[PDB]
Design a protein around this ligand. Structure first.
Ligand SMILES: NCc1c[nH]c2nc(N)[nH]c(=O)c12
Ligand SMILES: NCc1c[nH]c2nc(N)[nH]c(=O)c12
Ligand SMILES: [Zn+2]
Ligand SMILES: [Zn+2]
Lengths: 364, 364
């Protein structure tokens, strides 16, 4: 396999399906990336993560630098070796978790004093041995005034160039990993356009839509995606960071997004929320205490093959670790089955029908 | 397979190795039973418990009756079905967790008001669908005066007869499960003898040594085992309840014990303690932060095949669920490997040498 090759196999409207080939493996798109905060996808062995269908996972630069430490992970052979996941890993840059500041970067106290900058973020991602490296950005909160959105976007573009140069100057990283740029601009079309133009001029292997799902509603997010995604190079992956709910994902794919990550299936799994084709349920609810059905009636995951709602209800009620394990495996598997249905439907030219059918049932 | 058949294949001094055959499977002895407190061996799927080598697990009557409830489990098809473990399950009777009281039984408040008695304990164990049912006893704390030890022992023997009759009166239970009696008498030889005689007169499928590992030291426990185990019928299994550490197990086998359970490998696994052939280690210790070796250098478990001390150190430090999962799997696997080495050495007539070698290295 090459360092990086994105190929689009089929299209339907703005939606695409295809593959990213990298040295450590192939990623089928549209893709969902489980989040492995501090070198673990919570409550799952890597083999279980793979068994659910994941092709790639996400690691958080900010958290890993705080514990166990980036240099330590490098000394131990890199993140893949450390955690036992040998397929691609994407690392975020830390901009989201950040949100003293200056044009040079940021200093902050560990929740010890730490520093992030375009150069240091790229370095940490190198030390981790990331396959997909993200530019270091400044993420403005919502709502943002046009002036402040413009300032953070402009700084992010200067930082995107610094990220590009840092990545390129490190031969081993440049030859073996990929670098994605991050579009900013809040909800403003003109700023989103300026940001897309700046990133395309610099040139990246992929383009993330940053700064969404930070407090604007789905309607607004979709409105911004409507104009923002077409601004990005068509022939590279489009990554919507930190999204999201199943319906968010479907609508974002309809608008040209190829990659997703979110803590929702894992975090809310531990909390008792299980995804089903008829919408989410909270397994802690008393109505499930004697329900012998699986979490979802169609799901092919090992959890739905083997255990009842009643059992998982008890485990979560009781605070048992196995409850977190089973909920998380099911939810991640559900997400991967959603992505597979999306990929197949686009391939077969029936994605619009799938989206309609999905919504009708999920929100019944 | 029969309802119950214990066969002794080989002996060395007081030590024995053999098999218990039951309808749901064969149990190799000496046996270690992982404890599954409230219908789960903490942090492990049942398939993982089996993969470590366990032939049987223990469930706690007291806890299960409180949550999710015995009647509820019965309605859902029994404990095996509920938790997904299809091999034998032994249930304790509740006497240990108990320790208003009367000759009829005990009432207590949930940590709702609940009741236990010989009849109710046997009933709960039936509702759970237990394969090995334990008589309901009264467990005196250590130290005990001779008078109080005698009173609790005598009550326990009356309760053993009530347990026997309750079990026998329930045809489905009598035909498909086994019933073990529990010897009491604290540290007193005469009381232990009276208790053994009473239990043998009633007749049970197996005999537990109760009331030890409740505050007396290993020396005292071993002294009591020295005279107590030979009092029990030789041709039935001997079960030392709530023991214990690897060295406890080895010494108890040397004294004629066939079955063990304890929370130690699971509970202390979650706390950071890993068993090794060179003694226990606490993985949280800073000395392990960059140690690339497996938990134990010889252990054949999947954890030792795949992850380093450094990684598990980080997980436990961070409070990650995967840390509990990996520690627990390793510790249970270690215990099963200990039992296998014990069984093989007795079979081969070299158990005394094994015990000496084990101690020399474990305590080096
Ligand atoms: N939802 C927005 C988001 C999530 N993670 C992120 N990481 C970075 N660097 N930038 C961003 O805008 C975001
Ligand atoms: N270590 C003693 C012990 C553990 N569990 C027990 N359960 C019962 N019923 N009786 C006992 O004596 C014990
Ligand atoms: Zn499922
Ligand atoms: Zn091991």
């Amino acid at each position: 396999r090459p360092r990086f090759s994105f190929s689009i196999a089929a299209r339907e409207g703005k939606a695409r399906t295809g593959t990213i080939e990298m040295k450590r493996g192939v990623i089928r798109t549209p893709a969902f990336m489980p989040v492995g905060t501090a070198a673990t996808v919570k409550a799952l062995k890597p083999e279980t993560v793979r068994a659910t269908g994941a092709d790639i996972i996400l690691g958080n630069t900010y958290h890993l630098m705080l514990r166990p430490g980036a240099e330590r992970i490098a000394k131990l052979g890199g993140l893949h070796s450390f955690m036992g996941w040998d397929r691609p890993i994407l690392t975020d840059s830390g901009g989201f978790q950040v949100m003293k500041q200056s044009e040079e970067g940021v200093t902050f106290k560990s929740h010890s004093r730490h520093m992030l900058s375009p150069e240091r973020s790229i370095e940490i991602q190198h030390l981790l041995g990331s396959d997909i490296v993200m530019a270091f950005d400044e993420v403005t909160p919502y709502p943002a005034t046009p002036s402040r959105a413009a300032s953070s976007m402009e700084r992010s573009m200067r930082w995107a160039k610094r990220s590009r140069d840092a990545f390129d100057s490190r031969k081993e990283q440049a030859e073996n990993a990929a670098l994605f740029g991050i579009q900013q601009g809040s909800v403003f079309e003109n700023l989103r356009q300026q940001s897309a133009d700046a990133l395309a001029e610099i040139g990246f292997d992929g383009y993330a839509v940053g700064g969404l799902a930070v407090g604007e509603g789905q309607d607004e997010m979709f409105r911004v995606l409507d104009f923002s995604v077409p601004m990005l190079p068509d022939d590279k992956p489009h990554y919507l960071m930190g999204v999201g709910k199943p319906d968010d994902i479907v609508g974002a794919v309809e608008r040209g997004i190829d990659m997703f990550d979110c803590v929702l299936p894992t975090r809310s799994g531990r909390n008792g929320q299980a995804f089903t084709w008829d919408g989410p349920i909270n397994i802690r609810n008393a109505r499930f205490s004697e329900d012998l059905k699986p979490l979802d009636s169609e799901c092919h995951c090992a959890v739905c093959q083997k255990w009842s709602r009643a059992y998982i209800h008890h485990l979560i009620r009781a605070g048992e670790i196995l409850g977190a394990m089973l909920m998380t495996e099911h939810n991640i598997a559900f997400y991967q089955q959603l992505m597979q249905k999306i990929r197949d439907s686009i391939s077969e030219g029936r994605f619009s029908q799938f989206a309609q059918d999905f919504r009708a049932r999920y929100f019944a």
